[PDB]
C-alpha cells in the first residue's frame, strides 16, 4: 500500500530537471503521506521523527 | 533598449506634426536641465520641444518569474529578465509663449487617440544602422498629473524655473542578456530502497 | 558570515505560475498551562506547554489575462469536501537554489479577495488569498 | 506577460450612466469547522469548510443635474418588497473590451449617502451606495 | 456634462440667517432580515428589507453679536414638548437657484455646543447644533 | 457683520486672578425617547425629548509663586460637604466689555492635576481643574 | 484648446479695463518665471500684468464615460474624451508698487461679478484667423487662496522672489480628436438552440 | 509676575542620588454621587462628593554603574510586608530653593522596568519605577 | 559619572551564536490588595503587596545559512515536556566585560516567528522568539 | 578596503565594454558633484561615465559578534570587526544625449547577468603595487530605484541639476585592524569549598 | 574645553598616520563650509583632511545633579556642572579622488581599534603653552551613519556640494567654572517646643 502511493508521488518528475528544487519537492510529498499514516496509528513512535 | 524605444517614440510625434501641415514644430531628444546652462548645448535646445527621461522604476509583479528552457531530454538555465517603467516629460521651449501652448494641445490630442505602439504599428525606418538590434516590442503611454508638492520635487532637480510641460508614464521595457549559465540532462531513472526501521 | 535577504523566493502551490509579491503568516505557537498550590514559598506560578496552534497564510500576486487559478481552487468546495494540497515555499540564493524551506500540509483556501477599482491613480491590480492548514515544518540545512 | 491596471472599468446596473469613480467589496469567504478527539497523537485540530458568506458592495460617482437614480431605486422598498437587479462589472483593455467580469445576482440597495457641504474647500460632490446581494461568480477567460 | 461643487448652499431653518459653514449627516438606511431552511442546496442566506432608520444632522456656523438663535430654539423644551420645524437645504448654481434639495420633517435640537476658548491661536468662534428628525426626501429634477 | 474671535476672555470663579489659558466643555444635551405601535404605515419611530444632562468644565492656567488657589478650593471637601460657587465666563470685545456670557450655578471641583516634570525641554508649568455643576444659561444680547 | 481659452480670457479682462477708462493697465500672456531672467523676454514683461499657467489636472468623475454613436442600423466607435482643469496666476509687475495693488483690486472685483463664460457671452473677435477652430465652450472661474506651505512650493518653481499675485482655478477644457476607429452593423437576427442535458 | 518652568527639580526618596529625568502622576480625584426624586421641577440630577482616589507615580532616570537602588527597594517585599517611605518632590528656583512641594506618605514600589537593548541606534539606558501611595498634600507658600 | 549606552550586549542561551539585534520584556510586577473598614476617618483605601508576575521575553536576530537553532529548541516539546534552560543577558563596557546582568531561570519557547517575504524592498530577514520563564534577578555591582 | 573594492569594480565594467567592441565608453572613479564646478577637475570628467560613492551604512545583524581566538591552553583577545554597506551611482556624461542612454542600457544589462564578485571571479591585475593589501573578498550588487522625494534629497547634495543615472547598493566590505589586546591562559584547576550556614 | 579636546584628537590621528609611514596625510582643524568660498581661507584647506564641529547637544540624565561641598562644620554652595555632547565630521579633500578614499579607510580603521581617550592614554605635548588649562579627561568616540533625509539637512548648511566624509559622535565634555556662591555653618543645636492644642 505504501509503495503504491509513494510511486505515484515520484512519477510526477519523469522528465523534470534533476536539481535541488526537485529533491525538496519529492521529499516533502513523501513525508506528508507518512505523517498522515502515523497520525492514523499505522506506524510506531512518539513523534514522526 | 532605452535609446531605441525613445527614438521610435520621437518619430511618431514628428510624423503627426507632418500630417497636420505644421512645419515649425519638431521634437528633440535631449535633457531639460541644460536649457539655460549656457555651455555649448543650449543652442540646440532653442525653439524646440524637448523629450527627456526623469526617473526609472522596476515592475514588481514579474520579478520572481523563472526563465529556464526545456527541450528533448535537456535543460538550459538562464537568469530572470529585468522589467523597467519610465517617467517622461515633454517640455515646450518655443520662442513665443502662445506657440508653446498650441504644441502642448497637439501632444495631448495625439496620445488621446493612440496609446499602444508595436513593431507593426509604427512608421520608423527599419533600415537604419543604429536600429539593428530591435526585434519585437509593445508599450503603452499614460498621462500623469502631479500635485504641487510633487512639482516642487521634479523642478527642484532641473533648475528651479519651470516651463509649460506635460508628464507621461511608459510601461514595460524588457532588458535581458539571454545568456546561458548551465546545461544538464533530465531525470530518466528512478530507484527506491525500503528498510524496516 | 553574510545575512540573507528576503526579496527572492518561490512558491509551489499546484498552479502554473510560481512568482508572487508577498507571503506572511508562517508562525508556530503553543498555549500555556499554569499551576500553584498554597504551600509554596514562591508566590508565583509554574508553567507547562499544552495544545498547539497554527495561523493562516496569506499570498498576494498580480492579475493577468486568462489566469483564473484562485477562483478555480475555491470552486472545489462542495459542502464539507475540498481539494487539499501540499505547499512548499523556498528562499533562494543568487544561483536560484533553496536555502530555507517551509513545508505545509493539507492546505485549502477560505478567503479570495479581488482588486478594488479606482479611477484617479496609476495602480496595478493585486489579488489575495488566505489559506488554512494543519501543520508546518522548517528545514534549513 | 503584462499586468493589468485598475483605472478603466464599467458597471451595468440598470441606470443610464455606467461611469463611476470607485468599486469595493468583491470578496468570497467560507467559515471553518474544527474537531479533535482525545486519542489523537497530534495535539492540534483538523479543519473543514462549512457555510458561506458574501459582503456588501460599495459604488461611488459624482453628482449631476437631473440624475436622481440612486434615490429612485431606494424608493421601491415597500415593506418586504424591492426591485432586485443583476449587476455586471467589467475590467477593460485599451480597445474597451471586457477582460475580467464580476457577475452579481439579486442586488438591492440598503444605504444611500449624499455629499457633505463645506464652504472653504474646492471639492466636487460624491454620492455613495451600498448593496446587498446573494452571490458572485468571477469569469476570466 | 459638468459635475457639481459643494461650497455654495443655503439652509432654511426658521431663523434670520441662512449662511452656514458645514452640513453633514444626510443619509438613508434600511435594516436587513435573513433566512435559510435546512433543505436548500445553497449554503448561504436570502435577504429582505425590514425597518428603516434616520441619522442626526449637524449644522455649523460662526458666532456673531446679538444672535442667540441656537439657544432660543433649545429653550422651548418643556418636559415632553418642543417646537418642531421643517428644514429645507438646497445646493445652488451660479445664478443662486436650487438644484438638489433635501426636505426634512419634524426637526428639533438635542445638542448645542459652544466654542472653546484658547489664548495662543488666531481662530474665530464656531457653534454647532445636532438635530433629530423623522424623515427625509431628496428632490433633483 | 464681523465674526468674533476666541482669544480674549475672562473667568470669575472666586479667586484672585481671572486670566486663564483655555476653557472647554460648555455643552447642553437632551436624551431621546422613541415609540412605535404596530399599526403605523411608516416603518420608523417617532421621537420626544426626555431628561437633560450637563458635562464637566475644564480650566487651565499657569503656575505662579504663592498661588495655591486650586488646592485651597479642593481642600474644603469634608465627607459630603463642599463650598459651591457661581461661575461667570465672558467673551470680550476690543474695549474689554462682555459680549457672550456663560452663567454656571453650584460648581465644585472634582479633579486637580499638577504639571509633569521634564528635564530636556523648555516648557512652562500648566495646572488643570475639572468642575461639576448643575446648570448653564447662555446670554448674548 | 488651451491657447484659445486663455486668449479669450485675456480679452475679457482687457475690455473691463477699457470701460473703467484706465489706459495704462493691460494683461499679457507670457510666463512669470522669466521676469528677471535677463535674456530677451524680460523687456516685454515690464510694466504689465502677466497671466500664466502653472499646473494641469484631470477631472476624475467623467473619466470612464463612453463615446459611441448609434444611427440607423449602424454603430461607429470612438475613444473617450479627456477633460482638463487649469491653475492660473495673475502677477502684477507695474513700475510703482501702489499701482500694482490697484490693478489687483480690479481683477478681484471683475470675477466677483462675472464667473461664467460662453460663446454667446464673450466679446472676442470671431473673424481672427488664429481663432478659426473654436466652436462651443463653457467654463467657470473660482478664486483659490493657498497656505504658507503651498506658496513656498509655487514660488519655489518660479524663482524664489514673489510678486503681488492672485490665483484662480479654471474648470473643464474639453480635448477630443473625434476620430473613428470602427464601424459595424447592429443585431437583427436571434437564434436559440436547446438540448436536454 | 513671572511663570515657573518645569525642568529644574529634585526628589528625596531615600536613595543616594536625587537627579531624575521625568515625574508624572501627581493627581487628586473624588468620585461623584447623584440623586433625583420624582417631584422635582428640574429634570436633571444634583451632585455630591463621595470617596477619594489617588493615582500611581512614575519616576525615570538613567542607568549607572554600581547603582542597584531600584532593585534593592523592590527586594524588600516579603509576603504582605514592605519598607514604606516618605517622598518629597520639589520645584526649584534659580538659587536652587524649593517653591512648590509635593508631600507623599506610605510609598512602596510595585513595578520595576529595565531598559530595552537595541543595536542600531545611539541611545542611553533609562530605568523606570511605579509607586503606590496613600495620600498627597501640595504646599506652595 | 558617565551614563551607560544600550547597543553593546550579549546573550547566553545554549546556542552557538550570542549576537542579537534586540531584547525586550525584562520587567517585575506585583499585584495590589486594598482594604477599608467603615469607621475610618480617611475616605480612601490602604494598600498591600500580594502575588507576583513575570512577563515574556522577546529576542530577535538575523537569518543565516545552516542555523536552525530556533526550530530545534521548539521541536523538543513532547506533550507536557520541554528542555528548560538558564538565560544570562549582559550589558558590556568598552573592553567587553559585564556591567549589568539579568539572570533568568527555567526558560522555554512558546512562539517562533519567521520573516515575511516581500519583493519590492531591500530588507534582510529577521526571526523572532518569545520565551516563558519563572523568575528574574538583576545584578549590578 | 574602500578604494580597492571600487577599483576592482571599475575594471570589470571596462572589460565588458571591451568585449562588445565599444572603444568610446570608459568608466572613471571621481565625484559627481564637481561636474560643473569649473575648477581644474571638470576637464577629466568630460565625455565619460563617472562612478561615485554617495552614502555609508553599517550592517546591524553582525554588530555584536565576538572575535577571540583559542589555541592550545591560551586565548588572545581582539576587537569585533566593523561591516559596511555602500550606496553608489553610475552617472553618464557623454557629449551626445543619445550616447548616454546607450551606455546606461549596457550597465543595466551587465549586472543583470553577473551579480557576485570574488577573488577567483575577477580579472583585475594582481601584480599592481597599489593592490598589494587585498586577499579575499565577496560582494553582491543590487539595483536600487528611488522615489521622487528621494531623488530630490540625493541631487540636492550634488548641485541640483540631474543627469541620466542608475543607483546601486553594495554589500559587505569588511574593515578590521586585526590587532591583539591581551593574552591569557585557560582554566586548568578547579577548587570548591563548602560550609554549613 | 572645546578647543583643547579637539586639538588632542587631531594629534592622535596624525600620530597614527606617522606609524603607517604615510607622509602626505595630515588632519587640520578648520570649518568645512569655506572649502570653495574663495576668500583667503580656502588655500589652507587644499589637499588635506578637515575636522570640524557641526552640532552641540546637552546630556539630560546628569542635568539635575547637585554640586555642594561639606567639610568640617561648614558648607560651600556651587552651581551644577553643564555636560555637552559633540557631533563631528572628517572631510577628505585630497587632490586625487582615489587618495581620499584611502584616507577614509585609515580613519575608520583607527577608531575601530581605539575608542577611549584619557590623560594617561594620549601622546599630546603637555608642555605647550596653549594647553596649560587641561587636567583630567575621558571621552569616547562612536561612529554615526545618517539616512538620506539627514544628509540633505547636514550638507544644506555647508554649501550643497558633498565630499567623501565620515561622521562621529563625541561624549561628555565637562564645562564648569567652579566658583563659590555662599558659605554657611551646619546644624549643631536642636530645640523642640510642645503645646496642648
Secondary structure string (H, E, C) spanning chain D: CCCCECCCEEEECCCCCCCCCEEECCEEEEEEEEECCCCCCCCCCEEEEEEEECCCEEEEEECCCCCCHHHHHHCCCECCECCCEEEEEEEECCCCCEEEEEEEEEEEEEEEECCCEECCCCCECEEEEEEECCCEEEECC
Contact C124 D5 (CB under 8 A): yes
User: Dihedral angle at the C-alpha atoms of G121, G124, G130, G135, nearest 10 degrees?
Assistant: 10
E-strand spans in G120-181? 138-144, 165-175
d(CA B4, CA B10): 10
**In this complex, do K65 and H19 lie within 8 Å of one another by their Cβ atoms?**
yes
| Resolution for the entry shown, Å | 2.5
CA distance A9 to A22: 12
Question: For residues J127-146, b (16+ Cβ closer than 10 Å) or e, as one string?
Answer: eeeeeeeeeebebebebeee
Asked whether the beta carbons of residue K98 and residue J175 sit closer than 8 angstroms, the reply is no
Instruction: Please spell the DSSP secondary structure of A1-49, one letter per residue.
Output: -HHHHHHHHHHTTTTSB-SHHHHHHHHHHHHHHHHHHHHTTSS-SSS--
Please choose, from the candidates B3, B9, B11, B30, the residue with its C-alpha nearest in 3D space to the C-alpha of residue B138: B9
* Residues K161, J159 contacting (CB under 8 angstroms): yes
Strands C126-132 and C57-62: antiparallel
How far apart are the C-alpha atoms of D1 and I46, rounded to whole Å? 74
- The secondary structure element, H or E, covering residue K2 is helix K2-19
How many whole angstroms separate alpha carbon F101 and alpha carbon K23? 83
Under 8 Å between Cβ of H126 and H60: yes
For residues K187 and K75, give the distance between their C-alpha atoms in angstroms, rounded to a whole number: 11
- Give the residue among B142, C94, B57 at the shortest CA–CA distance from J108: B57
* D58 vs C contacts (CB less than 8 Å): none
Residue of chain D with shortest Cα separation from A39: D41
- Using alpha carbons, select from H107, H110, H105, H104 the residue that is nearest to residue H74: H110
- Rounded to an integer, what distance in angstroms lies between the CA atom of residue B82 and that of residue C28? 36
**Cβ neighbours for B43, distance < 8 A, ≥ 6 positions apart:** none
Q: Is B4 left (phi over 0), alpha (psi -120 to 50) or beta?
A: alpha
The reply to whether J43 touches chain B by the CB within 8 Å rule is no
Q: Which of B61, B142, B181 sits opposite C122 (nearest CB)?
A: B142
Distance from CA of J172 to the nearest CA of I (A): 13
CA separation for the pair D69, D75 (Å, rounded): 10
**DSSP for J93-135, written as a single string:** E-SSHHHHHHHHHHHHHHHHH--EEETTT----TT-GGGTT--
Which chain F residues are closer than 8 Å to K58 by Cβ? 120
Q: How far is CA C90 from each of CA C101, C127, G2, I54, rounded to the nearest angstrom? A: 4, 21, 55, 37
Residue with cell 495673475: G90
* F–H CB contacts, 8 A cutoff, strictly below: 108
- Residue K32 has what DSSP assignment? G
Q: Name the strands in the sheet holding K182-185, side by side, starting at the edge strand that comes first in the sequence.
A: K69-71, K74-77, K182-185
Three-state secondary structure call for residue F124: strand
Number of H helices, E strands in chain I: 1, 10
Residue F105 to residue F84: CA distance in whole angstroms: 8
Q: How many CB atoms lie within 10 A of CB I29?
A: 14
Q: Per DSSP, which regions of F1-141 are E strands?
A: 9-12, 22-24, 27-35, 46-53, 57-62, 85-92, 98-113, 117-118, 126-132, 136-139
CB contact under 8 A, D29 and C110: yes
Contact of J63 with H118, CB cutoff 8 Å: no
- Among candidates B161, C39, B98, C72, which has minimal Cα distance to J161? B161
Helix (H, G, I), strand (E, B) or coil at K102: helix
| Contact yes or no for C19 and B144 at CB 8 A | no
Kindly provide the b/e burial profile for residues C99-112, where b requires at least 16 CB atoms within 10 angstroms of the residue's own CB: bbbbbbbbbbbbbb
J183, J75 Cβ separation under 8 angstroms: yes
Q: Which of K126, J192, G2 is nearest to B97 (CA)?
A: G2
Task: Supply E132's cell numbers.
Answer: 433629530
Q: Distance between CA atoms of J118 and J96, rounded to whole angstroms?
A: 35
Residue C93 · residue C76 · CB < 8 Å: no
How many Cβ contacts (< 8 angstroms) between chains F and K?
A: 6
Task: Note whether D94 contacts C: Cβ–Cβ < 8 A.
Answer: no
Using the beta-carbon criterion (under 8 Å), do H7 and F118 form an inter-chain contact? yes
I141: nearest CA partner in chain H: H66
Q: How was this structure determined?
A: cryo-EM
Residue of B nearest to J150 (CA): B153
SS3 assignment, position B11? helix
DSSP codes joined into one string, E71-118: HHHHTT-BTTB---EEEEEEEE-TTS-EEEEEEEEEEEEEEEE---EE
* B5, B8, B10, B14 alpha-carbon torsion, rounded to 10°: -160
Q: Can you tell me the distance from the alpha carbon of K133 to that of K139, in angstroms, rounded to the nearest whole number?
A: 17
Q: Quote the cell numbers at residue H7.
A: 525642568
Helix (H) or strand (E) holding K76: strand K74-77
**Residue C38: exposure state from Cβ atoms within 10 A (0-12, 13-18, ≥19):** exposed
Chains C and D touch (3+ CB pairs under 8 A): yes
Residue G112, number of CB atoms within 10 A of its CB: 9
> What's the N-to-C CA distance of chain D in angstroms?
15
What 8-state DSSP symbol labels residue I116? -
- Of chain F, the end-to-end C-alpha distance in Å amounts to 15
State the smallest CA–CA distance between residue A1 and chain C in angstroms.
20
Give the C-alpha separation, K118 to K191, whole Å.
Answer: 51
DSSP C81-110: B---EEEEEEEE-TTS-EEEEEEEEEEEEE
Is J123 in contact with J131 (CB distance < 8 Å)? no
Residue of E nearest to F35 (CA): E134
Residue where the block lists cell 445664478: E95
Using CA atoms, how far apart are residues J72 and I38, in angstroms rounded to an integer? 76
J142 contacts I19? CB cut-off 8 A: no
- CA torsion, ordered I119, I121, I126, I127, to nearest 10 deg: -30
Closest-CA distance of chain E to residue G140, Å: 9
**List of long-range contacts for I51-55, beta carbons under 8 Å, 24+ apart:** I51/C43, I51/C44, I52/C43, I52/C44, I52/H77, I52/I28, I53/C44, I53/I29, I54/C44, I54/I27, I54/I28, I54/I29, I54/I133, I54/I134, I54/I135, I54/I136, I55/I25, I55/I27, I55/I29
Read off the C-alpha cell for K100: 581620499
Bridge-partner residues for E124, per DSSP? F5
Amino acid at each position: 500500500m505504501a509503495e503504491e502511493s509513494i510511486k505515484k508521488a515520484t512519477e510526477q518528475f519523469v522528465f523534470e530537471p534533476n536539481d535541488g528544487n526537485t529533491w525538496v519537492r519529492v521529499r516533502a510529498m513523501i513525508e506528508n503521506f507518512l505523517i498522515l499514516q502515523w497520525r492514523a496509528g499505522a506506524l510506531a513512535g512518539a513523534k514522526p521523527e | 533598449m532605452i535609446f531605441e524605444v525613445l527614438k521610435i517614440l520621437t518619430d511618431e510625434v514628428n510624423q503627426n506634426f507632418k500630417g497636420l501641415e505644421m512645419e515649425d514644430s519638431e521634437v528633440v531628444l535631449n535633457n531639460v536641465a541644460l536649457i539655460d546652462s549656457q555651455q555649448d548645448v543650449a543652442t540646440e535646445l532653442q525653439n524646440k520641444v524637448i523629450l527627456s527621461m526623469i526617473n526609472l522604476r522596476e515592475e514588481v509583479t514579474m520579478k520572481n518569474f523563472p526563465n529556464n528552457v526545456l527541450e528533448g531530454t535537456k535543460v538550459t538555465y538562464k537568469n530572470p529578465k529585468l522589467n523597467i517603467n519610465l517617467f517622461l516629460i515633454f517640455c515646450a521651449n518655443r520662442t513665443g509663449y502662445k506657440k508653446s501652448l498650441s504644441d502642448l494641445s497637439r501632444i495631448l490630442e495625439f496620445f488621446q487617440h493612440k496609446s499602444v505602439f508595436t513593431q507593426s504599428n509604427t512608421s520608423f525606418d527599419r533600415d537604419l544602422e543604429e536600429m539593428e538590434n530591435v526585434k519585437n516590442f509593445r508599450f503603452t503611454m499614460e498621462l500623469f498629473t502631479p500635485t504641487f508638492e510633487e512639482l516642487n520635487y521634479i523642478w527642484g532637480t532641473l533648475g528651479g524655473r519651470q516651463y509649460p510641460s506635460v508628464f507621461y508614464k511608459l510601461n514595460l521595457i524588457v532588458i535581458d542578456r539571454d545568456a546561458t549559465t548551465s546545461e544538464e540532462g533530465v531525470i530518466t531513472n528512478i530507484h527506491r530502497n525500503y528498510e524496516t526501521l | 558570515s553574510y545575512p540573507l535577504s528576503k526579496f527572492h523566493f518561490s512558491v509551489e502551490w499546484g498552479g502554473t505560475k510560481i512568482g508572487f509579491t508577498e507571503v506572511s503568516g508562517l508562525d508556530l505557537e503553543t498555549e500555556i498551562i499554569e499551576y500553584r498550590h498554597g504551600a509554596s514559598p514562591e508566590y508565583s506560578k509554574i508553567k507547562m506547554p499544552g495544545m498547539q496552534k497554527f495561523s493562516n497564510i496569506t499570498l498576494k500576486r498580480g492579475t493577468f489575462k486568462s489566469d483564473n487559478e484562485y477562483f478555480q481552487w475555491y470552486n472545489t468546495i462542495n459542502l464539507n469536501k475540498v481539494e487539499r494540497r501540499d505547499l512548499t515555499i523556498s528562499l533562494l540564493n543568487e544561483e536560484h537554489e533553496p536555502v530555507v524551506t517551509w513545508k505545509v500540509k493539507n492546505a485549502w483556501p477560505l478567503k479570495v479577495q479581488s482588486t478594488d477599482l479606482k479611477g484617479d491613480g496609476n495602480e496595478v491590480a493585486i489579488e489575495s488569498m488566505e489559506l488554512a492548514h494543519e501543520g508546518l515544518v522548517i528545514q534549513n540545512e
